[PDB]
Paper text:
Betaglycan (BG) is a transmembrane co-receptor of the transforming growth factor-β (TGF-β) family of signaling ligands. It functions by enabling binding of the three TGF-β isoforms to their signaling receptors and is additionally required for inhibin A (InhA) activity. BG is nonetheless essential in vivo, where it binds and potentiates the activity of the three TGF-β isoforms (TGF-β1, -β2 and -β3) by presenting them to their signaling receptors, TGF-β receptor type I (TGFBR1) and TGF-β receptor type II (TGFBR2)4. BG, and a homologous co-receptor of the TGF-β family known as endoglin (ENG) which potentiates the function of BMP9 and BMP10, are transmembrane proteins with a large (approximately 760 amino acids) extracellular region comprised of two domains: the membrane-distal orphan domain and the juxtamembrane zona pellucida (ZP) domain19,20.
Unlike BGZP-C, BGO does not prevent recruitment of TGFBR2 to TGF-βs, thus to understand the potentiation mechanism, we wanted to gain structural information on how the BG:TGF-β complex engages with the signaling receptors. We therefore sought to stabilize the TGF-β dimer in a single conformation and prepared an alternative complex replacing TGF-β3 with TGF-β1 inTGF-β1:zfBGO:(TGFBR2)2. Cryo-EM analysis of both complexes yielded density that closely accommodated the component structures and enabled domain placement without ambiguity. Despite this, it was difficult to build molecular models due to strong preferential alignment of the particles. The positioning of zfBGO on TGF-β is responsible for the 1:1 stoichiometry as a significant clash between OD1 from both protomers would occur with a 2:1 stoichiometry. To confirm the direct potentiation mechanism, we conducted an SPR potentiation assay using both zfBGO and ratBGO. It was surprising to discover that in contrast to ratBGO, zfBGO, which we used for X-ray crystallography, did not potentiate the binding of TGF-β2 to TGFBR2. ratBGO and zfBGO share 55.4% sequence identity, with no obvious difference that we could identify to explain the observed effect. From the structure it was apparent that the most pronounced difference lay within the TGF-β binding loop of OD1, where there is a two-residue insertion in ratBGO compared to zfBGO that allows the BL in ratBGO to make additional contacts with TGFBR2. The two amino acid deletion occurring in zfBG completely impairs the direct, yet not indirect, potentiation of TGFBR2 binding and is also present in most other boney fish families.
Numbering used by the authors:
A (entry chain C): 31 to 359
B (entry chain B), D (entry chain A): 1 to 112
C (entry chain E): 45 to 153
E (entry chain D): 47 to 153
């Protein structure tokens, strides 16, 4: 088992997931204004995968922690470098509330349930690229902005609609400002080293994930998300796999398995949580908190001593907080 | 089953999550996270009689021993089962970062 | 220290307390220093038009604003006045957590 | 990690495993058991200090809450970690059979 | 609640013509089928004292004997003459029939 870079087709894919914004500000002074304005200054990323297809960006709207139901009209100045389809996947928002989406030319607004589309409105306007110029335009056409957010291009954007009392009544773009209410989620591959000792077994499999740091500057326990879904297609599979999760620091492993069936064995030195989807779809044995050895070879030998051999695959990701597990047909 | 909704819609003295406001600076003394300055972590509390969600038969054994021998002081305890990670935003150097501090929001309480 | 100091890390901004015996940074950002070795550092500049206060995490070994730091181990941010031309310059360094938050230009009296 | 021998040989006031004998008939009422008539069923007990072998981050958070808030009525509890199966042999009809009552004897304890 | 019954095979009991004694059967077993009732048979004789206890369906006779006393919750010994030695047959359906053995209400 020579430590070599993990290939794209490897059943274990290591990604780092982070919620961040390029910049932004928030203001509670729009309470007087009957309409609230939110700005999402998307910025095109360095990725070359967006060349011809028109990028379609979803949206996740939720009431702020201090609000349960939101009814006030919400204007969204969704300026973007290029036309985008705004799939407004609202949530916990009262229907029938007008939602004016000021978008660049060619951008469309789509709603999961037609009630929102019938009540909402879409106005196409030309807006400045500059953050300050866009904020000035928003002030000129509305006299105030509830919040502004410059985010890098992403597929989803979680927004907590509502005026947070903590933030002042004035909005000033500050590069050091970041809040939960306005975040953009990003995921990128991370380097890893591993090997494959045994091929895909339809009886029981052993995939080992080693983690050094969760990419956290603090010294506390954070969540490590491991996805388990079929490698190809959406056909549910009946398979048994063994997960040896190694964390040098404290990290709680949250395993989410979708469209997979069978018995799963998890052995790790850290607490493990399983989503209800994994619980109902698969039978996961209750892990015993053991002081597992350190190092790839030591853990491999320890597993071989427990009869969970041969190892289907081993992989180690120094820096990451997200894992995807794919089952070969 | 014994989630937040079950014990918040109706008051049950048995093992379940009860409301608790955790404050970093005051209650917890943590000041290394800018915000959330405070959140909710509903903590597990309440005893479980013999007729309860006792997954491990040892818990049933302890319950029976206590019932037949009340002066034992050896009974199952209320423990979190599944805990939801908490998002947090904090600055390292001049760089803000959002992390998920796992297993600090308690939703499901079992007995063991 | 294994755990880096938790220092108030607001950059240059206007201030209300001038040469006060004891003052508070009034900084809403309490950041973990990038490295444990660096400690909280506070600088206070006074000109003929405005006064600026800057709180950061800085290495005491490396001089800041052309000034070596010798009060790195001070439990409290002890303020020393410097010979910055024209403007009045004060600077303190401290290894305690959020220690730069409280500023003492002259604890005397 | 805290084996029975560690707390039996040396008394530790922290969360540990304490001796307790349980007999099937008088205590649990398992009158259908042939042998053994009883056994030693140690139970997990002991206050949990902050500086100790803790696994769950929620337990650490609650311990810190207690430290900074002594009156909280909510602290991590000492509960079983590893439970040993009990080998028993009895008769079904007129046929001997040996079974393993899983998780019957305590071997480790944890703060959670 | 668990049901305790005497399931010892043909053994020897030290209580002969006694009002009542202990189950004198340390062996306990769970009946193969739930509907089985527990039958105790006593054949005390001058040559030797022999008793047995088993569990079986009331419908199926034991040792070519009809068990019409299975409806009794508690083991009550009905006396029937048999060549060689007297026969005392009891059947119980209630739980915990090993608490005591009763041969006759009158002393």
């Amino acid at each position: 088992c020579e430590l070599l870079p993990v290939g794209v087709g490897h059943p274990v894919q290591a990604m780092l997931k982070s919620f961040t914004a390029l910049s932004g500000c928030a203001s509670r002074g729009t309470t007087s204004h009957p309409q609230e304005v939110h700005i999402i200054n998307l910025r095109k990323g360095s990725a070359q995968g967006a060349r011809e297809k028109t990028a379609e960006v979803a949206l996740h709207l939720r009431p702020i922690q201090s609000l349960h139901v939101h009814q006030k009209p919400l204007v969204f100045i969704l300026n973007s470098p290029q036309p985008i389809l705004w799939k407004v996947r609202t949530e916990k928002l009262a229907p029938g509330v007008k939602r004016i989406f000021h978008v660049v030319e060619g951008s469309e607004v789509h709603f999961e349930v037609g009630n929102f589309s019938k009540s909402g409105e879409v106005k196409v306007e030309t807006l400045p690229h500059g953050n300050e110029h866009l904020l000035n335009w928003a002030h000129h056409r509305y006299t105030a902005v509830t919040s502004f957010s410059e985010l890098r291009m992403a597929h989803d954007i979680y927004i907590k609609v509502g005026e947070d009392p903590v933030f002042s009544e004035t909005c000033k773009i500050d590069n050091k400002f970041l809040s939960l209410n306005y975040l953009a989620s990003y995921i990128e591959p991370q380097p890893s080293t591993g090997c494959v000792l045994s091929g895909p077994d339809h009886e029981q499999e052993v995939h080992i994930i080693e983690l050094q740091a969760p990419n956290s500057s603090s010294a506390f326990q954070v969540d490590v998300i491991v996805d388990l879904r079929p490698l190809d297609g959406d056909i549910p599979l009946h398979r048994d796999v063994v997960l040896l999760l190694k964390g040098e620091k404290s990290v709680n492993w949250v395993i989410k398995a979708h469209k997979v069936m069978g018995k799963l064995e998890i052995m790790t030195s850290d607490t493990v949580s399983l989503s209800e989807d994994t619980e109902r779809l698969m039978q996961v044995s209750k892990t015993v908190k053991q002081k597992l050895p350190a190092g790839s070879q030591a853990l491999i030998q320890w597993a071989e001593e427990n009869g969970f051999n041969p190892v289907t695959s081993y992989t180690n990701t120094p820096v990451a907080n997200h894992f995807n597990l794919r089952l070969r047909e | 089953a014994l989630d937040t909704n079950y014990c918040f819609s109706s008051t049950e003295k048995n093992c379940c999550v009860r409301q608790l406001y955790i404050d970093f600076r005051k209650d917890l003394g943590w000041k290394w996270i800018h915000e959330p300055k405070g959140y909710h972590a509903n903590f597990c509390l309440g005893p479980c009689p013999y007729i309860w969600s006792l997954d491990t038969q040892y818990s049933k054994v302890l319950a029976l021993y206590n019932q037949h021998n009340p002066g034992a002081s050896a009974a199952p305890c209320c423990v979190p089962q599944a805990l939801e990670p908490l998002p947090i935003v904090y600055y390292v150097g001049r760089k803000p970062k959002v992390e998920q501090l796992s297993n600090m929001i308690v939703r499901s309480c079992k007995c063991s | 220290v294994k755990f880096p100091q938790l220092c108030k890390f607001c950059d240059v901004r206007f201030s209300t307390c001038d040469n006060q015996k004891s003052c508070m940074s009034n900084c809403s950002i309490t950041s973990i220093c990038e490295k444990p070795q660096e400690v909280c550092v506070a600088v206070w500049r006074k000109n003929d038009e405005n006064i600026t206060l800057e709180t950061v995490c800085h290495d005491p070994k490396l001089p800041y604003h052309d000034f070596i730091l010798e009060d790195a181990a001070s439990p409290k941010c002890i303020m020393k006045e410097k010979k910055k031309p024209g403007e009045t310059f004060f600077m303190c360094s401290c290894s305690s957590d959020e220690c730069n938050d409280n500023i003492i230009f002259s604890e005397e009296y």
